[PDB]
């Protein structure tokens, strides 16, 4: 019978729109920490799952990326292999292990959409822009003191999710969410349900210096009222950088089971 | 802990991208029926699934919809209900009863995509173009006798098929392969494997008078030899119609268990 | 040169691209023919708002607050009906501002904003005169099989929106109660344009569209409900509707031909 | 009318849409300032195709076979820098097609073709006469972590893809070597455009555009490739690789400020 790693199915397993993992990823980021209320966060933490050490400590991330799969096939498709993003994260803790919880997630590819959920990752479809640093010209900021950059998320046609990073400095301290390992929950909806709570197992972590400096973030109204419990209460430091890693699969934190 | 039919949880449930069914859907079809190389469309039906009492019989489909929840209140956001979606549909048999299956979909939405996935339908993401019927001008064409109606396919911005009808007469006939349960297999990646094959239990189908004609139908590369092998060897007639239909969920055919 | 035409050297073209047989263009050359689905809805506007909007020689409208918000999707071609075989070239939604206004005493309409969601037509837009960006733009549909939708009957409901930049800016809603042979009173008068662009190394112009073959199906009303947002400035809110009217869903042909000259102010 | 200017009666603006205060309007009032990574591969093209192209006034190219093939991202903004906050609004893809050619014995670049993915640099191409149509454009970008692409550096790739209405018609590869100093000749010339618009109820003129401020980063250049495909006529087929010829991968600025008459063929 006809075969391959996902849907669709066919005699050489060559249709599958996804790919078996490792995927490589290299990508730009403009992101900014934030203060979220600790109570509506612990409402997103699934059993085992539990608050930070710093319950309040969160982030908005924006981001562009390349992928490919081991072969690097899909590197010479740009229109393939390419995709943009914005993200919340929360920080948790599993066992005592720092962790970060990504309660919502739109892109603006299929692909990593589907592959989003593969891993649990709760991705939906949106539009995402996000400014690009220029290191010639007068149209845009470089990666220097005083380089503003934005970001905005629409979903649906309304302008939800809006921030600005003005950088001050140059560091090597990767920011706190974007260096902890993934807690996602593996569910599907059942047609005819056993969630499970998995970490993303990722190598070859890689930053560039990261540009900091103070950060703004704005929610407005179109993604309803448990979204918006996510709310900035305060916002902190911006950072822009790059950032790779390998992606490989995922461990199993908990399937409930006694 | 947070709670949904699917991602992304929320503590109220609210935020998931799909709503739980069932879901009415009323459409506008150009349909085209084809012969397919038998040998090719067997090397797609999965175990259970036999080679139909017409073994070469397909059909390739193009449609317009409007879909909406039991409580009908994604109705009036005309962005968040409509989709448009090319399928490929073969002739099969389960048990001796005729269903149809279908190796391949895309449609140009998210919700509708995923929500494919869940019913084991093998949904990608394309560019789907078709003409609708007009009723006043000169501008297209009428739902009458010489009427000619369009499709056509692009994927990664590549043309991958193109389809057309050139109407005759009005009939009270579906169309074969619109008129017959569907048997899909439910199986979605391994993060950290047991594929069930099922049928959609729909209920309310209900035709417009179908008008029937002449059927063109042409494929281009773009897609892979995978999806080619399922190229028409003939192109028989075209059906324009409206349909309308509610799904309610899966019922198991097979499970492969022993 | 650029005119295809006895001894002409420069590649031609009735638009850019220009090439050397002319097949590039971007436009075809008039008449073009059209054949729409409406959403509408009458609404009330600041008559002293409006009149700003109204160049020298229009006249405010016989009732100067009257004015329209409408969604439309289009499908067109050319005289030969080519691009009627390209479903993806030949079709574009739209959402227009119409203000009621007059040329010596002839009742006519102002479109002083539009968005469309196709090049072509925005380009078209602005060889009319008619000020066409782009947008997304959504609008119901009628269904005639099926419960995912309203039917044409007393009750049935059409939806609009439009996006601008990613901000929802407009809203409107239709619940039509009857069918009526009585079409809408700002889509069935001439329309007045403004020709200009911009200068690069203007003369304005005002003309009215000339159009044939005006055809619509029964037009079914009922109450209309509509919302601006901001997102497209206040210059945009000025217009924002006062008080809301009928609505009126309908399907509509017409044949677009060129301009007529009705002020180039010398 | 339309000029906000003293006295001013009718709505004004640089362009459509008009409005009481200017603000409306789709477009700004140049100087534009543009920041940019380009992809673009040297071709050799039939110097007899090219030239039928090339309107009176301008001559073939001191080499008339010299072609290019350019893919560019943009970031732009008018002198306030107001649009960079919102990045989509002050971002646009574009495909060119260059070809050589001189005014009065200067070198300049005539651009035939152009694609882009934006409506507002497409409408502003055509104030400028360059000829701008709508695509779908995809471009490799450069990488400085992880593997999932590649370095400015020996053995890099980088691609690029055009779309239009759905058919893919321009393929490009660039694989670069080394690094140097000298620009790409077609992209350090000033273009010869022509101005034209259709009349609606013409008169082109040739023009060049002026610009200010250029200035390129280091050139990675290296061996490319380019392939056209159906789906653009025979007009634009014509014009199709003969050879292809070096790649190169570079950043981009300069300010654009208005256009100087070359000839009004008078």
């Known amino acids: 019978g006809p075969v391959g790693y996902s849907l669709p199915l066919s005699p050489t397993g060559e249709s599958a729109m996804l790919?078996?993992?490792?995927?490589?990823?290299?990508?730009?980021?403009?992101?900014?920490?934030?203060?979220?209320?600790?109570?509506?966060?612990?409402?997103?933490?699934?059993?085992?799952?539990?608050?930070?050490?710093?319950?309040?400590?969160?982030?908005?991330?924006?981001?562009?990326?390349?992928?490919c799969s081991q072969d690097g096939a899909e590197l010479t498709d740009p229109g393939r292999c390419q995709f943009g993003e914005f993200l919340i994260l929360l920080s948790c803790e599993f066992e005592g292990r720092p962790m970060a919880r990504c309660p919502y997630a739109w892109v603006d590819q299929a692909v990593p959409m589907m592959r989003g959920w593969v891993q649990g990752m709760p991705k939906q479809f949106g539009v995402i822009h996000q400014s690009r640093p220029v290191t010639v010209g007068k149209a845009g900021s470089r990666l220097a003191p005083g380089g503003r950059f934005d970001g905005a998320l629409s979903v649906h046609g309304r302008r939800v999710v809006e921030a600005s990073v003005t950088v001050d400095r140059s560091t090597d301290q990767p920011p706190?969410?974007?260096?902890?390992?993934?807690?996602?929950?593996?569910?599907?909806?059942?047609?005819?349900?056993?969630?499970?709570?998995?970490?993303?197992?990722?190598?070859?972590?890689?930053?560039?210096?990261?540009?900091?400096?103070?950060?703004?973030?704005?929610?407005?109204?179109?993604?309803?009222?448990?979204?918006?419990?996510?709310?900035?209460?305060?916002?902190?430091?911006?950072?822009?950088?790059?950032?790779?890693?390998?992606?490989?699969?995922?461990?199993?934190l908990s399937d409930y089971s006694v």
């Open 19 to 67: 790919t078996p993992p490792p995927w490589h990823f290299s990508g730009e980021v403009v992101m900014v920490d934030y203060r979220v209320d600790p109570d509506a966060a612990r409402r997103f933490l699934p059993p085992g799952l539990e608050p930070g050490a710093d319950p309040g400590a969160a982030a908005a991330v924006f981001a562009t990326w390349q992928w």
């Open 176 to 252: 706190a969410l974007h260096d902890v390992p993934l807690a996602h929950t593996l569910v599907f909806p059942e047609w005819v349900p056993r969630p499970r709570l998995v970490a993303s197992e990722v190598s070859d972590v890689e930053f560039s210096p990261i540009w900091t400096g103070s950060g703004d973030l704005t929610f407005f109204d179109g993604l309803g009222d448990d979204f918006g419990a996510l709310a900035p209460l305060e916002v902190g430091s911006g950072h822009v950088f790059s950032y790779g890693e390998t992606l490989h699969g995922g461990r199993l």
